[PDB]
Design a protein around this ligand. Sequence first.
Ligand SMILES: [Zn+2]
Lengths: 531, 93, 50
Amino acid sequence: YGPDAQVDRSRLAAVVSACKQLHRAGLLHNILPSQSTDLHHSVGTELLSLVYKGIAPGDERQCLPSLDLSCKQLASGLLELAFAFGGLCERLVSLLLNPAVLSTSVIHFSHGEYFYSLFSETINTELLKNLDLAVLELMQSSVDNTKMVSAVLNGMLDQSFRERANQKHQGLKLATTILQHWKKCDSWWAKDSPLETKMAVLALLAKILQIDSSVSFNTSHGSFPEVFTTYISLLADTKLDLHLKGQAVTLLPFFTSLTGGSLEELRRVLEQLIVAHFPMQSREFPPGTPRFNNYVDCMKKFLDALELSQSPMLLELMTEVLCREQQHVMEELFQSSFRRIARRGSCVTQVGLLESVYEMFRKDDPRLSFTRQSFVDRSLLTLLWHCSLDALREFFSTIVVDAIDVLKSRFTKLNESTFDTQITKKMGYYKILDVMYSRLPKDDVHAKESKINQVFHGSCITEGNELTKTLIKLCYDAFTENMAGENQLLERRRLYHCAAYNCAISVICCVFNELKFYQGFLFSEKPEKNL
Amino acid sequence: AENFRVLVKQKKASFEEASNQLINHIEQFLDTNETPYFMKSIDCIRAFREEAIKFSEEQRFNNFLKALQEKVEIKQLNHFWEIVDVDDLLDMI
Amino acid sequence: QIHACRHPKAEEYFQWSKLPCGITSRNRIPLHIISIKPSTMWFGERSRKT
Ligand SMILES: [Zn+2]
């Protein structure tokens, strides 16, 4: 029938509702005949075959008929009625993978795919009660198509996400039965698999992490060697586009909590991704170019993943991709993310982040002096400007020892022209001292405190006139250093002088209130010869 | 290299223009101490060498082949050749 | 780069990828030309939001 025979379909819907009421009352097997081996099975399979072959198996010549709202719910009720008789989920899932070709405006594809897309809210609704015997078979005996099994799994995951109302245990059961079967689907991710199954497994990886709570999967609890290697192979896919790698790296905060060499492998694959995708100047992609849109989207997704994770894992790569360019267009969002990750987590989190960036910028890696400058002044300065309390003191006690050990007199190698690295580290230490003194109160840094004793040897009974005195001497000899003879790195040494003068201003305005020290330090210029 | 090698085909008949960006494409690659950059700098250098076998670049190729290695003489880069409290303070014032 | 020269048959010249001025390419490298025609009568005949 078409759009004119409404009485027949109305009576059919009425009798189907009556049958459903009999079933939920416990009289469906007593009214419809069920006194044979497969009698109720016979009527159920008859209804299922009818609803399956009513759409268009027999009109492969002209066209498929349109399904209106009257039939859209009629067939959806007939499906539940047929499924109420018995557990024919295996027969249904067998009818799902039907490699036919619809002849139709011309969209040729599997008939089972159309049957699913018409009523995708029924199969997943009924499969949650009979989980294992269906999902095991549809995982094992359907790897040839690699498309329908992904779609039914996505539908079941969506249903479970909607079924979180007081029944989240079914979602945990789904998570368990898929983590114990990831080994059975090692053919989806290969070097020759089409992009369709790649997108499918990526959506699967995305949805399982929110359908599988951390209780069952934190660290090597839910068979990590399978899922982690799958995701690594997904990231290493070069033929894959970047817009989907956006979500692939958006689901990063789940794998940040690792401790072994797996985090090192993730670091390696992220570096190999950013070296193959990101440009050097980020200016070859003007606004409006789709490459520019993909670039800014993946950058903001990396920033949001770093913000949600607050991990010391990828902030090094973020700072590196930030500072390998003189001025980046995403600088404002970078600084916002830095301030947010500094203010979000507990003291230990920002302490670890500061220690990581300090190790990054302090080591002797053969990098440009401008790169190390950009590193410190862009990341660590802002982090210390927006870090929480009860952390600056610990970072001080950790770093300032070696900082002042290097600052004292290590000014050598005036021939190889590599002095720029030394003076860059010096000015970085001066800026660190400036930003740490700009926030510490009066008695926190100049009265009897623990970190003052940490700077000295054991407990120092003095008020603390050792670290302040050494810092004053160092900064004074720094910005008063005459340049009559040295004419090799005038600009870098001028920046060093400016940083030292700023640090002096900070450390003097922090605790000193007498105007005598103001003159005697910041203005007592003594032009003996060239001072 | 692989990204900026399409312009030299027919669009920009002057290889002098596209050579500058191809040369700059490895400058910042040499600075970063990370290994993938070192592993892909030689890959771009191979594509830069590939043009002289079919375009006859040798009239200007050796002029930069030696300059790229002489730029190493200024740096170290020995691994890149592997491929080839008032009174006391008053006193000191 | 920016040109505003005029010619009675400049339309066919632009169709042949050539400005109204006789030059069509510099240093034997072809030029990529786009035409912007500022006018008002054309907009007064539109049938929808433009
Ligand atoms: Zn002109």
